[PDB]
Ligand binder design. Structure first.
Ligand SMILES: COc1cccc2[nH]ccc12
Lengths: 412, 412
């Protein structure tokens, strides 16, 4: 019979910091993590900036010998996972190791490593491909390497649902616990797509902002002068735990995960429908799953990518789901500051949604200077808004018309 | 309680055939699909052979223009999915489309596309990268494109658990239906890693058989002369359906999906533990999920990759789980004929497990000329074995120590 699921630990690498508290301080202060990319020569690229993780030290987590074998997206996923497990206070024992699993996903996975090995292959021959190429690059190896390091023998898997990955990963890990396949899951996502193929490939789709001369203002969700998403790196991980398991060990509980929705648009490979029909269907599923009145929703962490079609589709979906209550809730895009962490977006944004509940504050949508036609909700323009938040919703929408919604509420 | 899940449609591309009946005819005849890889200079490579899909015509499924946008692994996944939906007879309507979802996965995803776009990037720079590079290469686009083409609005996602992908996709899709989130799911996996990067990547780890002189004899699970797995391409898709839904429309039911097990080894990144402790937990989890005693199992489709460590771990696991029944069941590796389809292995082997139930026959382990030390189970050496099969297991054990088991039962 369906059990309740709470959040007992969180971990993060973002363009705003090397952990949760440092990231959250940047969020509440309206700070941009977006800057010209230093790690490669992008003079031939139409976009030369993004949200980099600054000063990441993998040797806070892993031996340099093991780190060298792993794509950055695996290193970021392990860092957030280790932080979340530590933050939980959970002790892994022979008694509980079979009941603790992991679902850390990625949208694109080890593109940097795949590019570097493709260069070796093409310039020098197959004998120069790394022996660690496959286990060092494939998406499931966050879950794999975390289980090996911590001794987690529960369900072990990874989702890849493009920009919806971190939201789906957390929702499905919550379903694992809810229906008794696990008592604890580490769940979230990680992404490092800032290589030639990543910036070049999104560039070739003309999906990215090209505001190279003012990167901190590039990400401007619902602003009339927005011109596409800002590519960002990092990771979010949460420890999800069955309520009575958490209560039994005296865990600190940040919030309860009460609702999860999925829906497919069945509309277009990359474009969202302008009326937000799939996102509305996904939110309604999530609110019904949480047994809520839609009027209980106080805060929405929007997908809010800063694309022309995506941002307006979300306003349409929120108006359609919430009717007059759409004018009472606060909705913000933290991508205004972090940029778009792709498969990690829904993981970091789930964490920001939990902290909005802990601290009773709506994070701002920075850069919202001139809201576009129809973008007339409370979008928390410019500055953080202290307010009552009992229920918070986090939305993600990705390529393939794939939608995810998570519903969190305060736990007393 | 929980709804029952049945299989009403199946679809496949494999090295044996461009559909299920052709593939299955090859399986029961002990035919190898392994041959030197064509239209590709493998001179500098230690492995020059594998399981290719032969004579695949994508214009049976897609326009030339839509096919040009999509990696081969996506093409293969869509072909299996379209076959499976056709085979099921299901009519998608406005009344059921929100209850029909997709979970089609891949282990490695778009290596061929990444490789071809690397060529362009290194030679000519980023402005030659295809606009469809990202959506045409990411793993969730089989689910994406299938949902868009057929108007499916149910749960839309993609698993990526390396060589466990197909088994986990089908199992979690079955959970979706059992727990009322969907009435129908298309589930399985696809793979096309026969590029420089895949042959090169696995070859650099010396994981592949190098028996270039006799490719049809390379894949020889539990044989003392085995020297690693054989890389293979293709796809499997199953239509999963709630039982009352299938009966109401007069669906042809192949078999019932009664159990799903997951575990993590938490042991090593690429190698299983010698005693198969993880594979044992996973099978026991699957049988407990099915409410079945190990004694009720009649047929196991092994993971059976032809690796020294992998094959012996599976013998140890089966002896551990099944005790005095270990010899009574039949266990075969269809990878002896198909090679190792990686993320699609669990999908095509779920189909062969269902057809073993339909036709009351254990497929052979071909090339099992000299069983290794302790390989003394009924491994169905050389030739198919007609026998009673009421309960059939399909196991996958992949990188990161990720395990999956599906339990299928005869339906009457
Ligand atoms: C039991 O585990 C699950 C995995 C995936 C999806 C699910 N929905 C309801 C339960 C469930």
């Amino acid at each position: 019979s369906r059990r309740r699921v709470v959040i007992t630990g969180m971990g993060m690498l973002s363009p705003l910091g090397l952990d949760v508290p440092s990231s959250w301080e940047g969020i509440l202060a309206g700070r941009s993590g977006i800057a010209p990319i230093e790690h490669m020569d992008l003079s031939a690229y139409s976009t030369r900036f993004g949200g980099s993780v600054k000063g990441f030290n993998v040797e806070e987590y892993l031996s340099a010998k093991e780190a060298r074998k792993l794509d950055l997206f695996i290193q970021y996923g392990l860092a957030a996972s280790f932080q979340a497990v530590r933050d939980s206070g959970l002790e892994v024992t022979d008694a509980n190791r079979e009941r603790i699993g992991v679902s850390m996903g990625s949208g694109i996975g080890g593109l940097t490593n795949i590019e570097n090995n493709c260069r070796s292959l093409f310039e020098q021959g197959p004998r120069r491909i790394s022996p660690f190429f496959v286990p060092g690059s494939i998406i499931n190896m966050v879950s794999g390497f975390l289980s090996i390091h911590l001794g987690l023998q529960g369900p072990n898997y990874a989702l890849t649902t493009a920009q919806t990955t971190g939201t789906h990963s957390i929702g499905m890990a919550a379903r694992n616990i809810a229906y008794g396949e696990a008592d604890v899951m580490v769940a979230g996502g990680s992404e490092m797509a800032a290589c030639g193929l990543g910036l070049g490939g999104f560039g070739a789709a003309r999906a990215l902002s090209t505001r190279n001369d003012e990167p901190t203002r590039a990400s401007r969700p619902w602003d009339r002068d927005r011109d596409g998403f800002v590519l960002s790196d990092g990771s979010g991980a949460l420890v999800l735990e069955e309520l009575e398991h958490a209560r039994a060990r005296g865990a600190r509980i940040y919030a309860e995960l009460v609702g999860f929705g999925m829906s497919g648009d069945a509309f277009h490979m990359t474009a969202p429908p302008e009326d937000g029909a799939g996102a509305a269907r996904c939110m309604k599923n999530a609110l019904r799953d949480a047994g809520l009145d839609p009027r209980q929703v106080d805060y929405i962490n929007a997908h809010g990518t800063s694309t022309p079609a995506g941002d307006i589709a979300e306003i349409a979906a929120v108006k359609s789901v919430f009717g007059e209550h759409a004018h009472a809730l606060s909705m913000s895009s933290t991508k205004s500051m972090t940029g778009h962490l792709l498969g990690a977006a829904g993981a970091v944004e789930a964490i920001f949604s939990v902290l909005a509940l802990r601290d009773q504050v709506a994070p701002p949508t920075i850069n919202l200077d001139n809201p576009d036609e129809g973008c007339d909700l409370d979008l928390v323009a410019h500055e953080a808004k202290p307010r009552k938040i009992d229920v918070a919703l986090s939305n993600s929408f990705g390529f393939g018309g794939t939608n995810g919604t998570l519903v969190f509420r305060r736990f007393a």
